[PDB]
C-alpha cells in the first residue's frame, strides 16, 4: 500500500487547491537574517492567545478576506503551530465555543456546514492530524482496496481520453452510452533489459497504453520516484521489421474535415503479445472513441458496477463507522466537547447534535479522503475514478444526513437506510465509551507534534502570514490598540517591531 508520509498527506489536505510553502523566501540575502529574526518573533506572538484570537477575528471582519483566504490562513496557522498542538487545540476549542454561541442565536443546524471560515478549516486540519495513524492503521487498507478495485474494473473497458467517458462507471453522465467495441490485448513490456507483461486494450490511445505500461513497469515504485510520462516515447519492436515509435498524433493519424482521431493500439494493428518498449526522447478537434455532442441498458450497466464494488464499499464504511474497535481519543474528545457545548446552550435536540458531529468528522474528513485518495496514497487519479468516488462519497454523505433523483440515490437506494443506522450507532458508541482525560489528550497531542519526519514549511508559513499582516496592518493595529490587555501586554507594539524587522 503506497501510503503518503505524514508531511505530504498534511500538505495536500492543508493546501488542496495547489505546496505553496515549498518556495524560496524571495528575500534579498542582506535582509534575510533580519526578516527571519522578525519571523521568529511573529512565531512568539502567535503564542499569545489574545493576539491570535484578535488576529483571526480582525482578518475575518475584512470584506476583502475571502473564503480561500480564510482556509489558507487556517492552514498557515496549523503549520506554524504544529509544534504546539495542545495550544492549537485550545485555540480550536475557544473558537468552537464562540461559534456555538453565535449559531445558537441563528439556526444551530447550519453550523460547520462548509469550509469557508478559519474555524471550519482549523477543524478539518485538526481531524486530519489526529486521524492520520488511524487511516494508516485501519482505514487505509479498505480505502486502497476500493481505489484498486475501481481502477481494475475501469481499465478492463474503454475510456475515451477526449470526453473522459467510460464503459464501466457509476455516473450515467460519464457512461459511454454508445456500446463501442474493442479487443483485450496483453503486451510484452520492456523499459529501454527483460520484459514484463501488460494487460492493455486495443482501443487505448498510445498515452493511455503508456500509463498502463508504466504502472506494471514500476509496480512497487512511488509516483514521485518515476519519470515524467512525457520524457518517454513508446517503441513497438517486431522482429524482422523496424522499431516503430508510436504516438497519439503522427503522420498516420486519421483526419476527416476538422476532426482528427487520437491514434490507438488498434490504429497501428499492434498484435496481442507484441513487444512495446519505453524509451527516452488550427480548429481541428481531437476525438478518440466517440465525438463530443435512464434506459434499462444503462441502469443495468451502472448497477453491475455498483454490485461489483459493493464489498469494497461495505468494508470501507464498516471500518470508518465501526463500534468493534477502540474509538480514537481525539474523536471521543471532540464529540464529547460538542455534547458539552450543546448542553451549555440548552440544545436538547439530538438532530442538531447529530448534524454538528456529521459536519465535524464524516462530512469534513472522511468524505474528503473518499473523494481524494491522493491525500492518502501516492497514486494518481482520473476524471472517471473521481466521478466514481464522488458517487460513493455522496452515498456516505446521505448516510450521515437525516432527510429521508441523483444517481447515487438510485444505485444505493437499498444501502443508504442501513448505513444511517451504522452512523446512529457510531455517535451512540462514541458518547457511551470511556472519556479521554485531559492528560491523555495532551499526551496524544504532544506526540502528534514530533512523530513524523520532514518540514511542513513553518518558516515560509510565517512569511505568508506576515503578508496578511502587511495587507491589513492598520486594521489589526487599530484592533489591538482598542483592547485593554492587548495594550497592557504591548501586543500592538510587538507587531510594529515585527513589521519593522520584516521591512
UniProtKB/Swiss-Prot annotation:
Q: In which tissues is it expressed?
A: Highly expressed in fetal kidney, and at slightly lower levels in fetal brain, lung and liver.
* Described purpose of this protein according to its UniProt entry: Receptor for SEMA4D. Plays a role in GABAergic synapse development. Mediates SEMA4A- and SEMA4D-dependent inhibitory synapse development. Plays a role in RHOA activation and subsequent changes of the actin cytoskeleton. Plays a role in axon guidance, invasive growth and cell migration.
Organism field: Homo sapiens (Human)
Cytoplasmic topological domain ranges are: 1-503
Concerning its family, UniProt says: Belongs to the plexin family.
Q: Which domain of life is it from?
A: Eukaryota
Post-translational modification (record): Phosphorylated on tyrosine residues by ERBB2 and MET upon SEMA4D binding. Proteolytic processing favors heterodimerization with PLXNB2 and SEMA4D binding.
This chain belongs to which protein, by name?
A: Plexin-B1
Residues at the site labelled Important for interaction with RAC1 and RND1: 244
Q: Quaternary arrangement and interactors, per the entry?
A: Monomer, and heterodimer with PLXNB2 after proteolytic processing. Binds RAC1 that has been activated by GTP binding. Interaction with SEMA4D promotes binding of cytoplasmic ligands. Interacts with PLXNA1. Interacts with ARHGEF11 and ARHGEF12. Interacts with ERBB2. Interacts with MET. Interacts with MST1R. Interacts with RRAS. Interacts with RHOD. Interacts with RND1. Interacts with NRP1 and NRP2.
Amino acid at each position: 500500500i503506497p501510503f503518503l508520509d505524514y508531511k505530504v498527506y498534511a500538505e495536500r489536505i492543508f493546501f488542496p487547491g495547489h505546496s505553496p510553502l515549498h518556495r524560496d523566501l524571495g528575500v534579498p540575502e542582506s535582509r534575510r537574517p533580519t526578516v527571519e529574526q522578525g519571523l521568529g518573533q511573529l512565531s512568539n506572538l502567535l503564542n499569545s492567545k489574545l493576539f491570535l484570537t484578535k488576529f483571526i477575528h480582525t482578518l475575518e471582519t475584512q470584506r476583502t478576506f475571502s473564503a480561500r483566504d480564510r482556509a489558507y490562513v487556517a492552514s498557515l496557522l496549523t503549520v506554524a503551530l504544529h509544534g504546539k498542538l495542545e495550544y492549537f487545540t485550545d485555540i480550536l476549542r475557544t473558537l468552537l465555543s464562540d461559534l456555538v454561541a453565535q449559531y445558537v442565536a441563528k439556526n444551530p443546524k447550519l453550523m460547520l456546514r462548509r469550509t469557508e471560515t478559519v474555524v471550519e478549516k482549523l477543524l478539518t486540519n485538526w481531524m486530519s492530524i489526529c486521524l492520520y495513524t488511524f487511516v494508516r492503521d485501519s482505514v487505509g487498507e479498505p480505502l486502497y482496496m476500493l481505489f484498486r478495485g475501481i481502477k481494475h474494473q475501469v481499465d478492463k473497458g474503454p475510456v475515451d481520453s477526449v470526453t473522459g467517458k467510460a464503459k464501466y462507471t457509476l455516473n450515467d453522465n460519464r457512461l459511454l452510452r454508445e456500446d463501442v467495441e474493442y479487443r483485450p490485448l496483453t503486451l510484452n513490456a520492456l523499459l529501454a533489459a527483460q520484459g514484463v507483461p501488460v494487460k492493455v486494450l486495443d482501443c487505448d490511445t498510445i498515452s493511455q497504453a503508456k500509463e498502463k505500461m508504466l504502472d506494471q513497469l514500476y509496480k512497487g515504485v512511488p509516483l514521485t520516484q518515476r519519470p515524467d510520462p512525457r520524457t518517454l516515447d513508446v517503441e513497438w519492436r517486431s522482429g524482422v521489421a523496424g522499431h516503430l515509435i508510436l504516438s497519439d498524433e503522427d503522420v498516420t493519424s486519421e483526419v476527416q474535415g476538422l476532426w482528427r482521431r487520437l491514434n490507438t493500439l488498434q490504429h497501428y494493428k499492434v498484435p496481442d503479445g507484441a513487444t512495446v518498449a519505453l524509451v527516452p526522447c488550427g480548429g481541428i478537434r481531437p476525438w478518440h472513441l466517440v465525438k463530443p455532442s435512464i434506459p434499462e441498458i444503462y441502469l443495468t450497466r451502472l448497477l453491475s458496477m455498483k454490485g461489483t464494488l459493493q464489498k469494497f464499499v461495505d468494508d470501507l464504511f464498516q471500518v470508518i463507522l465501526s463500534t468493534s474497535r477502540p474509538v480514537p481519543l481525539a474523536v471521543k474528545y471532540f464529540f464529547d466537547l460538542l455534547d458539552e457545548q450543546a448542553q451549555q446552550h440548552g440544545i436538547s435536540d439530538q438532530d442538531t447534535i447529530h448534524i454538528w458531529k456529521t459536519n465535524s468528522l464524516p462530512l469534513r474528513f472522511w468524505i474528503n479522503i473518499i473523494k481524494n485518495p491522493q491525500f492518502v496514497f501516492d497514486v494518481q487519479t482520473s476524471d472517471n475514478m473521481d466521478a466514481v468516488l464522488l458517487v460513493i462519497a455522496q452515498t456516505f454523505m446521505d448516510a450521515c444526513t437525516l432527510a429521508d433523483s441523483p444517481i447515487n440515490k438510485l444505485l444505493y437506494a437499498r444501502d443508504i437506510p442501513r448505513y444511517k443506522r451504522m452512523v446512529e450507532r457510531y455517535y451512540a458508541d462514541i458518547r457511551q465509551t470511556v472519556p479521554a482525560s485531559d492528560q491523555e489528550m495532551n499526551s496524544v497531542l504532544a506526540e502528534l507534534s514530533w512523530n513524523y519526519s520532514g518540514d511542513l514549511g513553518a518558516r515560509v508559513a510565517l512569511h505568508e502570514l506576515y503578508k496578511y499582516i502587511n495587507k491589513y496592518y492598520d486594521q489589526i493595529i487599530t484592533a489591538l490598540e482598542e483592547d485593554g490587555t492587548a495594550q497592557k501586554m504591548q501586543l500592538g507594539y510587538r507587531l510594529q517591531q515585527i513589521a519593522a524587522a520584516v521591512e
